[PDB]
Ligand binder design. Structure first.
Ligand SMILES: Nc1ncnc2c1ncn2[C@@H]1O[C@H](COP(=O)(O)OP(=O)(O)OP(=O)(O)O)[C@@H](O)[C@H]1O
Lengths: 337, 48, 292
């Protein structure tokens, strides 16, 4: 609502709307619909075959605002507006289609072929968001009509399986409207006004948000199983690769603090390839999905070792000791975050 | 300086200009770029 | 340097300047080699040679090491960049093979710059049998009309006539190994050929079918792990036959350029194959020569 149409986009826009309704009635003829008084699939006929003036003014109106709203979405997504030269637009490219493809309309069905224009990958990336926005517009319109999602379409209860997020939208209708949007934007650029794609933002959302306030869970053995002397081994299997920490913790370890942040835990974060005890250093490499981490503690000389699929993980230097020196204290138990 | 080096007069009007350049501008380039080497190589491949 | 972002987004004068950089470097070492080979008898030429050794060898070596180690540069090297690179390789290799007292001073700088070139250069120039398969090839990209328009030999062999073929290079290095000749007679082989062959095979390991058996005979280049075992074996035999005298840090240079090959070969292949060098370290304990 806040944005307005610049005069250049407007006086190219009336011709854009003409071309769009033309392409609509010709896609209507390759789908094969004919001219008739009433629209019906069995009769395979449709009154909107004639040009916009003879075409029902109601449908002419709807074509026109959906075109203008689409291009306002183009402008509102941050598309770099620009023109190569007005001569390119003044030299509109106007082939003839074959006689069989010719229709009742006196003018030609396809003045311009998609062949000589090669849309930029950034342009298809843009038209992806354009399809997202068009689908969302249709969806809110149906919600305000009163429709709601249902696996089976029912006109009585206003149920539609198509009222789903576009990521889950059906592939058939998805690609149909998607190719319609292909050709719409391709004609927009090829008619003369070469809109430049917006900046391809490489910023990663990082998925910082999580369910509830809890951000990690700490799994540990019972405090009574603490070991104060001897050599011990246990394994950690990483089903999925991500932010996990495995190691040995003292029985006083807090369940709400990260492992290794305090002095009560000795952990290895392979996601960042880091050891964790009162801070983080660089230790070992990263694990992948399915990797198994074996944790060794030698409570005789107070050393700790880690493995990744068998091979010893090593420090920044050549030392294999993750933690050379620590007090026995009250013992250690296996722990993971 | 190439023009004046072919000339007989080897007096350089911009001697302190090039003194500043060579002994300040050049080393700060090296230090800055070795300190932030990763900053340039990072090319939307998400390092750091 | 950041070749990706420069090539996809860059202002045209910067583009032209970055091609002109290595074009000027190319003509620099071309005139340098021409005037030094013409100068069999002894100040402008001396200034050019000094500038060459001081800067051109470090500039090209550092740039090309960066390109090779970061494995990118493919879109950086396009029309006229390839031909600049072929002129540079022809000159540097032809003079690293030719023997002169002037070269014998900075042989090693050449020995490490030529190796960096081999890693950075993206088209298989040792092999021409299946070279047409390689899409990056300026021959395939540039098309017949432009290849006729450009000052191109129109034959891949004619592009680099001085350089030898890879298969005869490794059979001759095997022959030299079994002959056991000293480093003194023909040093050039063991300071340039070995580094370039190891850097070449190291870059094109994954291009070879041994990593991707698919698209068979559509492979750009053909190479095998057994060829690598032969290479490592005859390198060890070179560092074997050549222990008595002459010592040399070129031991350490060839070891560091062969570090990739011995790292990427399997440990089971390391066993029973490289234990000779560990036991020779004891066998040459009385000797002063340094190995590995
Ligand atoms: N309000 C309307 N008045 C007249 N014709 C209409 C109207 N709405 C749609 N049409 C006609 O129907 C065609 C396509 O219908 P539309 O895209 O609105 O269907 P839909 O309800 O979204 O379909 P679906 O069953 O897949 O959910 C239009 O091109 C036009 O010819």
């Amino acid at each position: 609502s806040q944005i307005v149409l610049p005069p250049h986009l407007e006086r190219i826009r009336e011709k854009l709307a003409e071309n769009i309704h033309e392409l609509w009635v010709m896609n209507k003829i390759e789908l094969g619909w004919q001219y008739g008084p009433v629209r019906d699939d069995n009769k395979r006929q449709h009154p909107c075959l004639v040009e916009f003036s003879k075409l029902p003014e109601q449908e002419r109106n709807y074509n026109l605002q959906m075109s203008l709203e689409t291009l306002k979405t183009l402008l509102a997504l941050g598309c770099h507006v620009g023109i190569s030269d007005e001569h390119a637009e003044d030299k509109v490219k106007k082939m003839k289609l074959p006689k069989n493809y010719q229709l009742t309309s006196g003018y030609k069905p396809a003045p311009m072929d998609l062949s000589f224009i090669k849309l930029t990958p950034s342009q298809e990336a843009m038209v992806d968001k354009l399809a997202e926005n068009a689908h969302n517009v249709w969806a809110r319109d149906r919600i305000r009509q009163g429709w709601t999602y249902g696996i089976q379409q029912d006109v009585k209860n206003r149920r539609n399986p198509r009222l789903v997020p576009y990521t889950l939208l059906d592939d058939r209708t998805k690609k149909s409207n998607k190719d319609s949007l292909r050709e719409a934007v391709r004609t927009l650029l090829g008619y003369g006004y070469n809109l430049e794609a917006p900046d391809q933002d490489h910023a990663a959302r990082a998925e910082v948000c999580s369910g509830t306030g809890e951000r990690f869970r700490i799994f540990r053995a019972e405090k009574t199983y603490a070991v104060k002397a001897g050599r011990w081994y246990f394994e950690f299997e990483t089903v999925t690769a991500g932010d996990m920490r495995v190691g040995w913790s003292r029985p006083g370890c807090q369940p709400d603090q990260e492992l290794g942040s305090d002095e009560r835990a000795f952990a290895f974060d392979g996601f960042k390839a880091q050891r964790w005890h009162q801070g983080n250093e660089h230790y070992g490499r990263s694990w992948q999905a399915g990797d198994v981490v074996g944790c060794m503690v030698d409570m005789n000389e107070h050393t700790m070792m880690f493995t990744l699929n068998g091979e010893i993980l090593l420090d920044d230097s050549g030392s294999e000791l993750a933690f050379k020196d620590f007090d026995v204290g009250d013992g250690f138990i296996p722990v993971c975050s | 300086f190439d023009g004046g080096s072919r000339g007989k007069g080897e007096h350089f009007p911009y001697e302190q200009e090039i003194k500043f350049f060579a002994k300040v501008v050049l080393p700060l380039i090296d230090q800055y770029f070795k300190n932030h080497r990763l900053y340039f190589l990072s090319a939307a491949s998400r390092p750091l | 340097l950041d070749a990706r972002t420069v090539m996809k987004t860059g202002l045209e004068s910067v583009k032209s300047a970055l091609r002109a950089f290595l074009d000027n470097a190319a003509e620099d070492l071309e005139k340098t080699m021409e005037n030094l080979k013409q100068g069999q008898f002894t100040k402008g030429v001396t200034q050019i040679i000094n500038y060459t050794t001081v800067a051109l060898l470090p500039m090209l070596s550092s740039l090309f090491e960066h390109i090779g180690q970061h494995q990118f540069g493919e879109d950086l090297i396009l029309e006229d960049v390839q031909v600049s690179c072929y002129r540079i390789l022809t000159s540097l290799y032809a003079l690293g093979t030719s023997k002169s007292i002037y070269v014998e001073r900075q042989r090693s700088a050449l020995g490490e710059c030529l190796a960096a070139f081999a890693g950075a250069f993206p088209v298989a120039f040792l092999e021409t049998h299946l070279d047409k398969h390689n899409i990056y090839s300026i021959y395939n990209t540039k098309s017949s009309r432009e290849r006729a328009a450009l000052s191109l030999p129109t034959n891949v062999e004619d592009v680099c006539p001085n350089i030898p073929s890879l298969e005869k290079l490794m059979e001759e290095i095997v022959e030299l190994a079994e002959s056991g000749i000293r480093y003194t007679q023909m040093p050039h082989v063991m300071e340039v050929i070995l580094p370039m062959l190891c850097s070449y095979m190291s870059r094109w390991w994954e291009h070879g079918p041994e990593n991707n058996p698919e698209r068979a005979e559509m492979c750009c280049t053909a190479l095998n792990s057994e060829h690598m075992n032969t290479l490592l074996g005859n390198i060890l035999k070179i560092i074997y036959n050549n222990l008595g005298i002459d010592e040399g840090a070129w031991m350490k240079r060839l070891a560091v350029f062969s570090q990739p090959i011995i790292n990427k070969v399997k440990p089971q292949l390391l066993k029973t194959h490289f234990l000779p060098l560990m036991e020779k370290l004891k066998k040459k304990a009385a000797t002063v020569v340094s190995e590995e």
